[model samples]
Target: MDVFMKGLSKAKEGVVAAAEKTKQGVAEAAGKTKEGVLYVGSKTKEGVVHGVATVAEKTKEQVTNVGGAVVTGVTAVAQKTVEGAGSIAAATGFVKKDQLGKNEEGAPQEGILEDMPVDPDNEAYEMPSEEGYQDYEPEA
Candidate 1:
């Protein structure tokens, strides 16, 4: 009877130790999961913002070729969204542009339409830096 109780105590200790380790591992997993989410969200935001800008750049060039009020209106909406995206991207460190440059087509004159007058509600042209996107550190 004494021997049996001693063995049981040892087994209980082993089980308790394993349980403790598993508990700590679960807590660490939660932290890792949260960090993973932040990483994914930030990267997704960067990609989307840049994507919209590229689309708008391409669309603007095409608009001049089409020359219609309907196309112009559509382009305006896209450009507005792109402008907003640029600001977000800039704040996030995904982009950092000080001035307007060439369009996606490498045409300096493609987007130069000062007479068209960009909507006041929309932001002006903004772009990523020549150095490229610098990964933003998550805020504490």
Candidate 2:
């Protein structure tokens, strides 16, 4: 009976040792899982930030192109307006014949006779709207 009790005591010690080992393993695994979760969260945040920055850069480039297009359109319209005004002025014949060669009070006489800027070759001047992207057409 004493031998049986000794054997039972040893068996109980072994079981307790096994339970302690299992508990330690479980604690270590929990810690590792927590670290993994934090890492993944950080990575996801970085990815989102990078994606937003890329989108903003692309949008800025697009806005720049659109702004250039607006300027081109405004310039073209102004040119047309000037041409129209010059034709109307010539048709009205507002200037006196004697003032054809007369200079302004302080400015040069060449001011009245300046010619309109002409561009016979439109191919040499490319507008900025059609440079990198394929969405917009070149402005006149």
Candidate 3:
């Protein structure tokens, strides 16, 4: 009878020890899980901020590039227009001075005009420089 009781006590002790170990393991796992969750949250926030900043930077650069191109195009067109007006004014002066102005026929002068070029040597003529049309930077 005593032997049986001794064996039973040993078994109870073993069960109690196993239960305590399981509790400790579970507590440790819970603590680690919380730490993992916090780490993930911090990383997520950091990634989002970095991503937004990068996107903003890239967008600004692209906008600046596009704006620069547009300004350049507009400048080119304006310069061409000014140059055209200057040529027209010079031609008008020449026609008036030479007294060989538009024909009374009035049908057209475009045919002859197309074949002809504005007189570069004309005293009244002024031409725009090509370099003057190319320098403008736009803001982003």
lDDT of 1 by residue, 11-126 (tens): 99999999999999999999988887575655687798899989999998887777687777898999899889878876789556679886678555646575567556534533
Worst 10-residue lDDT window, candidate 1: 125-134
The global C-alpha lDDT for each of the candidates, from Candidate 1 onward, is: 0.78, 0.80, 0.80
Task: Sort the candidates on TM-score, descending order.
Answer: 1, 3, 2
Error of 1 at 105 (Å): 99
TM-score of candidate 1 to 2 decimals = 0.27
RMSD of each: 43.5, 42.4, 40.4
Native-referenced Cα lDDT, model 1? 0.78
How many residue pairs collide in each prediction?
0, 0, 0
Clashing pairs in 3: none
Model 3, CA-based lDDT? 0.80
Per-residue C-alpha lDDT of model 3 across residues 3-117, encoded as one tens digit per residue: 9999999999999999999989999999898877565655687798899989998999899989989999999999999888988888777754555677679676568467556
Off by over 4 Å in 2: 40-140
Q: Pairing residues by index, what is the TM-score of model 3?
A: 0.26
